[PDB]
Amino acid sequence: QFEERHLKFLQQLGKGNFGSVEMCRYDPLQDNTGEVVAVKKLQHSTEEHLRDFEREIEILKSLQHDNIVKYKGVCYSAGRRNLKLIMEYLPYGSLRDYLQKHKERIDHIKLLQYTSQICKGMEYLGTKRYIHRDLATRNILVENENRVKIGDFGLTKVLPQDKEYYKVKEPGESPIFWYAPESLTESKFSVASDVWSFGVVLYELFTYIEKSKSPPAEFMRMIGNDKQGQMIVFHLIELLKNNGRLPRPDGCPDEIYMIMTECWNNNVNQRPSFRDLALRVDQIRDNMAG
Ligand SMILES: Cc1nc2cnc3[nH]ccc3c2n1C1CCNCC1
């Protein structure tokens, strides 16, 4: 529970899109010597959005792991008539921007360490039966040069007891290019569909966030760049189901690409678990370093 009077705006961070994160100073001396926090708020609050935002707050509050952005609290702002989420602020920002800026510096050994940390945070989510549904480098944060955290849980879902999947049908936009085929065809989300998206995340790291090599640019190039609207989806589905995949990024080792391909399996049941992935990645790193 943060006091609204001591919460001062700084900059924006990520806009919604049904939500927005700001950089704020928590400064309740008012001295201007204060802790910098990340503040999430509703962009177009409504009854369904508030119920959804409350679920998101409970999701993050329930998570305590080295590879998950720390939940700080809530602010009952505009005098206990508005709800805002308080999370820790990470100066290094998104992994996406971090890798775009320091690409020379960040070598393969380093990308695998980040890859492994994402797996571990993903493993912990599975422990609580949470489906992230939105794995992407822009949703991963850098704490320091040696550590990454999963930084957003806006689309996160709790699986019903003993359910393997959650069918969610939503209006509006979806990050189609990070979706598993069954998520595109039947709105089915599961740990396995998070494994598929993780495979796309690994692809993003190895392309070093080079624009012309991004999953949307690569799929559109395979689909045909002319296509608009619904025709993109039809073509994406047909391509994926008949094993059309993202190409191997330039200079990416074959063993690392094989990991990506195993995650991109049309058979949900045949996709590796996050524990299998963290083990393989850590062994590869260890068989390079140690
Ligand atoms: C871009 C960015 N930098 C952040 C630092 N700390 C944060 N703590 C929580 C978010 C968060 C930050 N973000 C993004 C992450 C993805 N959604 C928008 C904000």
Strand and helix map with partners:
Blueprint: E1 7-14, E2 20-26, E3 35-41, H1 47-61, E4 71-76, H2 77-80, E5 82-88, H3 95-101, H4 108-127, E6 130-131, E7 140-144, E8 147-150, E9 157-158, E10 166-167, H5 181-186, E11 188-189, H6 191-206, H7 215-223, H8 230-241, H9 254-263, H10 274-289
Antiparallel strand pairs: 1-2, 2-3, 3-5, 4-5, 6-9, 7-8, 10-11
The structure holds ligand JAK.
Modified residues (Phosphotyrosine): 26, 124, 130, 165-166
Binding site for ATP: 13-21, 40
Subcellular location: Endomembrane system; Cytoplasm; Nucleus
Description:
The protein has 290 residues and is α+β, with helices and mostly antiparallel strands. The chain folds into 2 domains: 1-89, Phosphorylase Kinase, domain 1 (2-Layer Sandwich); 90-286, Orthogonal Bundle (Transferase(Phosphotransferase), domain 1), CATH 1.10.510. Helix content is 40%, strand content 18%. It has 10 helices and 11 strands. It has helices at 47-61, 77-80, 95-101, 108-127, 181-186, 191-206, 215-223, 230-241, 254-263, 274-289, and strands at 7-14, 20-26, 35-41, 71-76, 82-88, 130-131, 140-144, 147-150, 157-158, 166-167, 188-189. Strands 1-2-3-5-4 form a 5-stranded antiparallel sheet. The radius of gyration is 20 Å and the shape is globular. It starts with 6 loop residues before the first strand and ends with a helix. The protein binds the ligand Cc1nc2cnc3[nH]ccc3c2n1C1CCNCC1. Ligand JAK binds at residues 13-14, 21, 38, 69, 87, 89-90, 93-94, 139, 141, 151-152.
